[PDB]
Write an enzyme that holds these catalytic residues in place. Structure first.
Site, short mmCIF file in Angstrom:
data_model
loop_
_atom_site.label_atom_id
_atom_site.label_comp_id
_atom_site.label_asym_id
_atom_site.label_seq_id
_atom_site.Cartn_x
_atom_site.Cartn_y
_atom_site.Cartn_z
N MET A 177 -1.76 -6.91 7.09
CA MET A 177 -2.64 -7.93 6.54
C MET A 177 -2.10 -8.58 5.28
O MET A 177 -2.89 -9.03 4.44
CB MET A 177 -4.00 -7.29 6.24
CG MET A 177 -4.55 -6.47 7.40
SD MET A 177 -5.94 -5.43 6.91
CE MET A 177 -6.38 -4.71 8.52
N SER A 178 -0.78 -8.69 5.15
CA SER A 178 -0.21 -9.27 3.95
C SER A 178 1.19 -9.83 4.18
O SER A 178 1.54 -10.24 5.29
CB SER A 178 -0.12 -8.19 2.86
OG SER A 178 0.94 -7.30 3.15
N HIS A 223 -7.23 4.00 6.16
CA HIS A 223 -6.45 3.72 4.95
C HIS A 223 -5.91 4.99 4.31
O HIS A 223 -4.91 4.95 3.59
CB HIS A 223 -7.29 2.94 3.94
CG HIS A 223 -6.49 2.33 2.82
ND1 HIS A 223 -5.48 1.42 3.04
CD2 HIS A 223 -6.58 2.46 1.48
CE1 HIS A 223 -4.98 1.01 1.88
NE2 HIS A 223 -5.64 1.64 0.92
N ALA A 278 2.80 -1.67 4.02
CA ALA A 278 2.51 -0.57 4.93
C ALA A 278 2.14 -1.28 6.23
O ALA A 278 1.47 -2.32 6.18
CB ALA A 278 1.34 0.24 4.41
N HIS A 282 -3.28 0.10 -5.06
CA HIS A 282 -2.67 -1.10 -5.61
C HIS A 282 -3.03 -1.09 -7.10
O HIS A 282 -4.05 -1.65 -7.50
CB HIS A 282 -3.21 -2.35 -4.90
CG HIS A 282 -2.69 -2.54 -3.51
ND1 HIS A 282 -3.13 -1.80 -2.43
CD2 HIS A 282 -1.78 -3.41 -3.00
CE1 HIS A 282 -2.52 -2.20 -1.33
NE2 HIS A 282 -1.69 -3.18 -1.65
N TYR A 310 -8.17 -10.61 2.76
CA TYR A 310 -9.41 -9.88 3.03
C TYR A 310 -10.20 -9.51 1.78
O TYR A 310 -11.36 -9.11 1.87
CB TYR A 310 -9.15 -8.65 3.91
CG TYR A 310 -8.26 -7.58 3.32
CD1 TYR A 310 -8.67 -6.82 2.22
CD2 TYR A 310 -7.01 -7.30 3.88
CE1 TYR A 310 -7.86 -5.83 1.70
CE2 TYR A 310 -6.19 -6.31 3.36
CZ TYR A 310 -6.62 -5.58 2.27
OH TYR A 310 -5.79 -4.62 1.73
N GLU A 311 -9.58 -9.65 0.62
CA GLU A 311 -10.25 -9.35 -0.64
C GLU A 311 -11.14 -10.53 -1.02
O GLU A 311 -11.95 -10.43 -1.93
CB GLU A 311 -9.23 -9.12 -1.77
CG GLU A 311 -8.42 -7.85 -1.64
CD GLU A 311 -7.46 -7.64 -2.80
OE1 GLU A 311 -7.92 -7.42 -3.95
OE2 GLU A 311 -6.24 -7.68 -2.56
N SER A 354 0.80 -1.22 0.00
CA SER A 354 0.00 0.00 0.00
C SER A 354 0.84 1.28 0.00
O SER A 354 1.80 1.41 0.77
CB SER A 354 -0.98 -0.01 1.18
OG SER A 354 -2.15 -0.74 0.88
N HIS A 382 -4.69 -9.60 -1.26
CA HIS A 382 -4.84 -9.83 0.17
C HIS A 382 -5.97 -10.80 0.44
O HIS A 382 -6.97 -10.82 -0.27
CB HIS A 382 -5.15 -8.53 0.90
CG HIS A 382 -4.23 -7.39 0.57
ND1 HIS A 382 -4.36 -6.63 -0.57
CD2 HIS A 382 -3.18 -6.87 1.26
CE1 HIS A 382 -3.44 -5.69 -0.57
NE2 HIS A 382 -2.71 -5.81 0.53
N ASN A 394 1.54 4.24 10.58
CA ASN A 394 0.74 4.73 11.69
C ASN A 394 1.09 4.06 13.00
O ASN A 394 1.59 2.94 13.02
CB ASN A 394 -0.75 4.49 11.40
CG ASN A 394 -1.07 3.03 11.09
OD1 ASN A 394 -1.77 2.36 11.86
ND2 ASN A 394 -0.56 2.53 9.97
#
Lengths: 284, 284, 284
Positions: free
Chosen positions: C219-220, C257, C116, C64, C88-89, C33, C86, C243
């Site tokens: 998450m990746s 995001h 990220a 992306h 979550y997709e 990201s 990912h 963050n």
């Protein structure tokens, strides 16, 4: 999908087995990695390849013969799973645990589970035998559970207790038997944590697992224990510490299935004698 | 599979409900195990069995009536889920959470979630009411999430924040209401951890869960909260501590759904009065 | 379902790529990201949209681009994934990790992963670059693993080791390169923990994750690293701390995001120069 086997599927397999062997074991033993030699002590042994048994999955992992063996072990009739199934093979838990319910429908009352495991407790050494006192089911935390889906009340209740999973009496007898064996190294004991695999753990993961209170780590057993307890089977088992897990980053080493299997041979005679003797302690 | 419901599926169910009742609730309440009695205080109540509602899943767990009830609670129009759905029933989270989005499409703005839970915090006692301040979504760590798959922007954003999941104002009002009730036992508060189930936790697992910072453990709620927050619903809820989880190996005891349900009855009147009073505090 | 791609599927895609570009990269770079700008430094760049490449999944997440770019970076031929996939997709790991095996079949020997991430270690600040020294695969604990299912021995072994996942030599070179850059802020380093998403973590979850020994959360990445190591690729990478995760309940803030992407721009030039320079250190 959730459990695909109907009650009848289990029944059919049970009847098939009963009509192909005169033996009627009350004890079932699941042999993990490098522990397939336990069948060697069986007399009056009758073997069925998993592929012969209707509805039975297939052992694809090396060191897992994939045979169901009926026979007498120390004067006690038993059925042994020479090799087991694992989630990492692509099998959902309801397939991995299929044999346990079939065993229940065969008249089996006690289940002995064995496996190869990485030692998390620093006091463990390769070749150690750890009596499983308790477990931590990581896949279960996420919902990956052999009991997921509609509950079959002909097997057990909707919300089975697991705090008493490993029979207290058997673990006591296990320790007594170990003493009779005159073994130098003390019989270890602890918590077994299960994770999916098939890759071996990172150093960070190992530290985490130990910190969670785990003594040994593996990729099996727990689902079988949950299913066994759900259908009322007395359960007890142990882990063969086949390797010390790398607990520090870059500490010259990495786990491998070879050392796992190779270790199972040195401690083969050990746990083989142990299991044979335990037959006498198993009640009924 | 990932979420199978299209936006229209939710819309259809919402329209069906709107055309079968004149009531227009702004508050939705999901009643967990042994908490189905909350509907008893509803006046002008209209009931729909989940099986009547197009697209609605089925409550299969005992103590979960499986009815959606519209009515007035303390002068406030509400819709209650007398019984809920759980992952251990074989339901993916997108099915377990279906009603929450339907509620949003009905005009609902606030969601109250309740559940039965095992106490991890040693200070809790059976009968305690724990206001949920935060949660730990174990299934979420593995990716089992109701939001998994393509994001429906007509409901919410791709990466919703969860740190503010439980409305701060409502928890404050909750405490004030508790004081007005003149209750002897203090209103508890803490973190609720969700795991898959359906089996109850082992001692090792319990110790681990407490060490993770969890105050209570259960097999529901969290997915509904995540979906609620994703679509903009104000959320607040609580756990009825129905049992003290066995924290020490072989400490004469084991959890059971019976004690869970039985506990829900003694503390029924308690949380029933509490929820009715909270209606007045819910804004709008 | 378990891995759906046959060995041939990977081969077909590899051959397609080889017949559409004259370039033959030995290094592959996956841009996370807000890191899609890394392709900007590429000369002799040839771009393929993921949708053009047979068998390739689709990047649906903002930031992306969803393009595979071949080109020269600091005199070194490379292939970059401008955007990744990912879980979550809605993508199973065997789809998320498809490109990694294709890269192996293209002749690629080294894989650089970037992402990220939210900082768990309190010493991290937004804009920090954390060299990934180790990881914690939470989805893996439950069995969600790209290697789940029958093992393709033409790619690697059944039980691959992960303790040495991140190349020691490259991390050393990484630190040396950072010093040559004359950067004020020290190059951070630590453990990256992966969770499913897509929602951001609660305060309780964050505390738990840090306590597990994690330095950054995302998450990746992890699934790609596991697949890379399984097929013998040298791996190294880093997280852009976009963050600081809320570690205290109600501490005026929540992740988004937007800040993630916005952060990727300020530190873009930073890690862009860094990666370009690292090309020279990558062996062969």
């Amino acid at each position: 999908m959730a459990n695909g086997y109907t009650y009848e599927d289990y029944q059919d397999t049970a009847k098939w087995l009963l009509s192909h062997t005169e033996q009627r074991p009350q004890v079932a033993v699941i042999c993990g990695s490098g522990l397939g030699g336990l069948v060697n002590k069986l007399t009056q042994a009758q073997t069925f390849d998993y592929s012969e048994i209707p509805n039975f999955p297939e052992s694809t992992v090396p060191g897992h013969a994939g045979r169901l063996v009926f026979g007498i072990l120390n004067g006690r009739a038993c059925v042994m799973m020479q090799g087991r199934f694992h989630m990492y093979e692509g099998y959902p838990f309801w397939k991995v645990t299929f044999p346990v319910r079939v065993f229940r429908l065969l008249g089996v009352e006690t289940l002995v589970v064995t496996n190869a495991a990485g030692g998390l407790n620093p006091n463990f050494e390769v070749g150690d035998i750890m009596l499983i006192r308790d477990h931590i089911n990581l896949p279960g935390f996420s919902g990956e559970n052999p009991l997921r889906g509609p509950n079959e009340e002909r097997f057990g209740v909707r919300f089975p207790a697991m705090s008493d999973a490993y029979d207290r009496d058997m673990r006591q007898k296990a320790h007594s038997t170990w003493k009779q064996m005159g073994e130098q190294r003390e019989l270890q004991e602890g918590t077994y944590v299960m994770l999916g695999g098939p890759n071996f753990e990172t150093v960070a993961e190992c530290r985490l697992l130990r910190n969670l209170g785990a003594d040994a780590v593996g990729m099996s057993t727990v689902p079988e224990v949950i299913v066994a307890r759900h259908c009322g089977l007395r359960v007890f088992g142990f882990s063969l510490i086949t390797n010390k897990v790398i607990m520090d980053t870059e500490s010259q080493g990495k786990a491998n299935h070879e050392e796992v299997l190779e270790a199972g041979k040195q401690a083969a005679q050990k746990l083989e004698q142990f299991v044979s003797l335990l037959m006498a302690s198993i009640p009924v």
